[PDB]
Amino acid sequence: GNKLFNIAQRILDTNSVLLTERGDHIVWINNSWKFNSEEPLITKLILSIRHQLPKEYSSELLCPRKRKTVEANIRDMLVDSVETDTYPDKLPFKNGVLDLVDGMFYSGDDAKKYTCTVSTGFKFDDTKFVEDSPEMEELMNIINDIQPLTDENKKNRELYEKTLSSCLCGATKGCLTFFFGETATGKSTTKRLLKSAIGDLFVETGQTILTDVLDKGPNPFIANMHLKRSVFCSELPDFACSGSKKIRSDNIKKLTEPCVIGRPCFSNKINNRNHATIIIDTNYKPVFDRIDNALMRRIAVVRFRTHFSQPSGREAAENNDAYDKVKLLDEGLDGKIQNNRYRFAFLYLLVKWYKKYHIPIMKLYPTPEEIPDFAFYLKIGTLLVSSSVKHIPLMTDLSKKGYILYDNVVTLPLTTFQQKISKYFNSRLFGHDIESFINRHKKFANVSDEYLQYIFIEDISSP
Amino acid sequence: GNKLFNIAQRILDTNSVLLTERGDHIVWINNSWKFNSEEPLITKLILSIRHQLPKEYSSELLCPRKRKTVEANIRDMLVDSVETDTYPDKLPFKNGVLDLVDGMFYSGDDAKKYTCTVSTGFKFDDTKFVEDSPEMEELMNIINDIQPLTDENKKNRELYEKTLSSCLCGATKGCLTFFFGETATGKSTTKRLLKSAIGDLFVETGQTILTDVLDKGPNPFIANMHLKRSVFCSELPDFACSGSKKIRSDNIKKLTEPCVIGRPCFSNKINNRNHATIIIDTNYKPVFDRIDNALMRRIAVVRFRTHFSQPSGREAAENNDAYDKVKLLDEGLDGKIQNNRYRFAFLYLLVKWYKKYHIPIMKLYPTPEEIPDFAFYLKIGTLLVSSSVKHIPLMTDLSKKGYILYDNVVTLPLTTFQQKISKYFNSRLFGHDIESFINRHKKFANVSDEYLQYIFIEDISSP
DNA sequence: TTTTTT
Ligand SMILES: Nc1ncnc2c1ncn2[C@@H]1O[C@H](COP(=O)(O)OP(=O)(O)OP(=O)(O)O)[C@@H](O)[C@H]1O
Numbered sequence: 001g002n003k004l005f006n007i008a009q010r011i012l013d014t015n016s017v018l019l020t021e022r023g024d025h026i027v028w029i030n031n032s033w034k035f036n037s038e039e040p041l042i043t044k045l046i047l048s049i050r051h052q053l054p055k056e057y058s059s060e061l062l063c064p065r066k067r068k069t070v071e072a073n074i075r076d077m078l079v080d081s082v083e084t085d086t087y088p089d090k091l092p093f094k095n096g097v098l099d100l101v102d103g104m105f106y107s108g109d110d111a112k113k114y115t116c117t118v119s120t121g122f123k124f125d126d127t128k129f130v131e132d133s134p135e136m137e138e139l140m141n142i143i144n145d146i147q148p149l150t151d152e153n154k155k156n157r158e159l160y161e162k163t164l165s166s167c168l169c170g171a172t173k174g175c176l177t178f179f180f181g182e183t184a185t186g187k188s189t190t191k192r193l194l195k196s197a198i199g200d201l202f203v204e205t206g207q208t209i210l211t212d213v214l215d216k217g218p219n220p221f222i223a224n225m226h227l228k229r230s231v232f233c234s235e236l237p238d239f240a241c242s243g244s245k246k247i248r249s250d251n252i253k254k255l256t257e258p259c260v261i262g263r264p265c266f267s268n269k270i271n272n273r274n275h276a277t278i279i280i281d282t283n284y285k286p287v288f289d290r291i292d293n294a295l296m297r298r299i300a301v302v303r304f305r306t307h308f309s310q311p312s313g314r315e316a317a318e319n320n321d322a323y324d325k326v327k328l329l330d331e332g333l334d335g336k337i338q339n340n341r342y343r344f345a346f347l348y349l350l351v352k353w354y355k356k357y358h359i360p361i362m363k364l365y366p367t368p369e370e371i372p373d374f375a376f377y378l379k380i381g382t383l384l385v386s387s388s389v390k391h392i393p394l395m396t397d398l399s400k401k402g403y404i405l406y407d408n409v410v411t412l413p414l415t416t417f418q419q420k421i422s423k424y425f426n427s428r429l430f431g432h433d434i435e436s437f438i439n440r441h442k443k444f445a446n447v448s449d450e451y452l453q454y455i456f457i458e459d460i461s462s463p
Numbered sequence: 464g465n466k467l468f469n470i471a472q473r474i475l476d477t478n479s480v481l482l483t484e485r486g487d488h489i490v491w492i493n494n495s496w497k498f499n500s501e502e503p504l505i506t507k508l509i510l511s512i513r514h515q516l517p518k519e520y521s522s523e524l525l526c527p528r529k530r531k532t533v534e535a536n537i538r539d540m541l542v543d544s545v546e547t548d549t550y551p552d553k554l555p556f557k558n559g560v561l562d563l564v565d566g567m568f569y570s571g572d573d574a575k576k577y578t579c580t581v582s583t584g585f586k587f588d589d590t591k592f593v594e595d596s597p598e599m600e601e602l603m604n605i606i607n608d609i610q611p612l613t614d615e616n617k618k619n620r621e622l623y624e625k626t627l628s629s630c631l632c633g634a635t636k637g638c639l640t641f642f643f644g645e646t647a648t649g650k651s652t653t654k655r656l657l658k659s660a661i662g663d664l665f666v667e668t669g670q671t672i673l674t675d676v677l678d679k680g681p682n683p684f685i686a687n688m689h690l691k692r693s694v695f696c697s698e699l700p701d702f703a704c705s706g707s708k709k710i711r712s713d714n715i716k717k718l719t720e721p722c723v724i725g726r727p728c729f730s731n732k733i734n735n736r737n738h739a740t741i742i743i744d745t746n747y748k749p750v751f752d753r754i755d756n757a758l759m760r761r762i763a764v765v766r767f768r769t770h771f772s773q774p775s776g777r778e779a780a781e782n783n784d785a786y787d788k789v790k791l792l793d794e795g796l797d798g799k800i801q802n803n804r805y806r807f808a809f810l811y812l813l814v815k816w817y818k819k820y821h822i823p824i825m826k827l828y829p830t831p832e833e834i835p836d837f838a839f840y841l842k843i844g845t846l847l848v849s850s851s852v853k854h855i856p857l858m859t860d861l862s863k864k865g866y867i868l869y870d871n872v873v874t875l876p877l878t879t880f881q882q883k884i885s886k887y888f889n890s891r892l893f894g895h896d897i898e899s900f901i902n903r904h905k906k907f908a909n910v911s912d913e914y915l916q917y918i919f920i921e922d923i924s925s926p
Numbered sequence: 927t928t929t930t931t932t
Pocket residue numbers: 141142143145146181182183184185186187188189190308328329330331333334757
């Protein structure tokens with residue numbers, strides 16, 4: 001047969017070009033998988049791999065028309081599709097893949113077996129990926145300044161390290177984290193360090209993903225989150241001001257699912273794979289429209305309690321309760337960070353933290369006791385018990401306290417209930433929470449019959 | 464071998480075509496990097512560089528089809544991308560790049576190593592970039608008329624020199640500048656001089672960005688801010704009249720970050736690079752919806768106090784208190800400025816000021832003292848200290864001062880608090896400000912117990 | 927209004 005078909009067959013035999021389910025062709029060039037929806041990178045591969053072919057086939061690949069013919073043959077012979085990005089414990093670079101389990105770096109065919117379509121965007125360097133380096137001690141000093149290693153801050157520092165370490169994993173995560181602190185506290189420095197550590201796997205979007213409907217019309221903000229591993233949203237408005245849009249809880253529930261529904265402009269694709277940890281940098285406590293048990297299990301908070309002040313205003317910052325330590329700031333730090341001085345030391349520290357927590361299994365846990373707005377419900381869980389058959393026999397005491405056995409179940413009137421809950425809740429500050437909770441569980445037998453099926457745990461105890 | 468392939472390889476070896484992360488190709492023609500989507504700049508480059516090749520190669524480049532073949536080979540050879548605009552201390556021109564560190568001018572290949580996409584839009588002239596010039600004395604007279612060299616105007620003068628100089632640097636800035644002055648004081652003269660000095664690096668933008676959300680829908684104003692170095696906001700509406708929109712503080716926070724989130728029309732792009740200094744010219748005191756420590760750290764102000772009046776109204780202007788000096792009004796000055804008469808003389812002054820200030824490090828500092836609104840918040844922080852363990856052991860004396868014990872913490876009743884803070888603030892003007900401060904830190908002990916968690920320094924320090 | 931569409 002003709003030599004062009006033989007060249008196409010030999011190229012296909014190396015498995016350097018593949019077709020995905022989304023309809024795009026990926027090519028293995030320069031030790032990386034690359035694709036482009038508007039430029040057919042196939043011809044680049046044809047020109048690049050001309051050296052591996054024998055001598056009599058190299059000369060005919062210098063003409064663009066024969067390259068077009070070979071690309072047409074390859075497109076004809078390529079029929080079926082394959083799946084991509086199935087290994088959550090591999091970190092891809094521009095010249096290889098790093099294994100997070102043991103720490104070796106793989107290049108060439110060894111890295112080809114893990115079909116990763118995303119990368120940091122820069123080459124990995126072994127010389128700078130060391131522990132004993134002049135930059136490392138300085139980075140450790142900076143980090144110990146931001147998060148001191150004290151017995152009081154141990155628990156917060158653990159969440160800090162775990163949340164930062166989770167950015168290397170390519171799996172769905174069921175919790176999003178808030179970075180809370182005052183001004184000049186080090187939150188943006190941490191953001192820029194993470195950006196300079198992970199490169200193109202990092203992205204930041206607007207706040208419209210938390211207050212607006214996601215699936216109405218085109219929405220590039222949701223679409224750009226596909227296959228990313230870290231998403232930052234920062235500088236939320238103060239909700240105390242009038243006209244502020246409160247955070248939608250259903251958006252929070254949707255953002256923790258493995259697939260997110262959204263559509264970019266001029267597109268028909270509506271599914272996006274969610275691999276990104278979500279970090280919200282803020283200065284004020286969040287406010288939600290509706291609070292329920294489903295929302296409280298997807299929220300975590302990390303505190304920042306160190307101030308970096310000019311010498312002129314130091315004496316003022318020492319009189320504030322929002323700070324636990326005041327230190328002079330360095331003016332040249334931001335320029336050093338912008339030049340990627342601490343890229344590989346921070347990456348090495350992130351991998352070292354990855355071994356500590358996520359090797360058995362990757363999991364994030366909520367911290368519902370850090371939000372004041374969640375206080376009302378939490379202690380409600382420790383004060384009331386739903387009515388049951390076991391409470392019927394002891395009615396002798398409950399009728400003494402004012403309970404009524406109505407339809408063979410122990411019951412308490414709303415009017416009888418409200419003062420009883422008023423003795424343990426400050427009616428002035430929790431005025432709205434009490435009327436909120438009473439109305440979603442009222443039970444009315446008749447126009448004049450009112451009752452609620454709950455029993456206090458203190459009354460159930462034997463006196 | 465293929466002759467056209469050899470021509471393409473030799474062309475590529477000169478590093479005249481580059482591929483960016485944006486998917487665009489940039490070429491080096493006429494001592495400048497140019498790029499655009501629908502133009503065949505590559506073929507222009509092949510035709511232009513024809514003379515650098517041996518004579519057996521120059522003849523073939525006269526046929527358009529062979530040029531298309533060479534372009535195809537070149538496009539197939541370019542696989543990797545490169546960074547652009549990484550030097551903040553360079554001033555790109557149409558025919559070269561000027562280094563601000565030493566002052567001498569590069570051209571040719573020397574200017575190629577700085578991949579600067581933007582340019583001033585005009586041609587540099589060596590002869591006109593001279594100090595001893597008869598235009599220089601006129602420019603110096605105008606500048607000294609706007610900002611006199613008096614002792615009481617020393618510090619302000621320095622600020623006036625710094626901000627303009629910051630227009631040369633290509634880095635990010637974290638402060639906002641207000642050009643506050645009454646009518647006919649020289650603000651637009653400085654704006655026009657700066658525009659004539661820098662060319663297309665200048666941009667003028669309306670007040671929509673200050674008062675409206677930037678992440679909702681498309682926003683063309685953010686799109687063209689990319690890689691600009693000077694942004695002016697002119698004709699700020701008066702806020703005393705009803706219906707005026709208050710300035711958003713979150714917009715101020717978002718305008719000082721290295722990356723600004725915004726989307727141009729008909730596009731999916733969401734990221735931009737912020738390299739511009741923003742100057743707002745107004746005739747009235749600005750007002751902000753919310754005032755916090757974060758906002759008063761990103762604001763600077765410089766004053767204009769010299770008035771230009773026609774001789775008819777001099778009697779009206781010489782007695783006004785808002786002015787300091789009155790001068791003759793020159794009608795022909797407007798004629799000279801838009802003729803680009805002082806294009807290079809002002810540039811020399813800008814470079815001199817850049818050597819005076821920004822050689823060690825580029826930094827802009829805020830001036831929160833000169834704002835009528837911020838003084839209320841500034842003063843309170845210097846008379847109140849939050850209670851802690853240190854102020855506990857003085858338990859006895861503070862009881863005689865009206866302070867009340869609660870939860871083993873010193874507290875001050877609100878009723879005891881209003882008279883004492885009214886000793887420094889009269890309620891007729893700062894009543895709303897006082898109440899706005901109160902609501903933030905208001906804490907409740909009982910249904911009728913009103914108190915604050917602060918202690919006065921004057922009430923604890925011995926007289 | 928703007929993606930839409932050309
Ligand atoms: N370890 C450190 N030592 C000295 N200075 C530091 C250190 N870490 C950070 N800084 C500096 O302190 C300042 C803190 O600014 P940064 O933007 O990080 O704070 P922030 O709390 O995130 O601010 P904001 O929320 O208001 O944007 C910066 O100038 C930063 O360079």
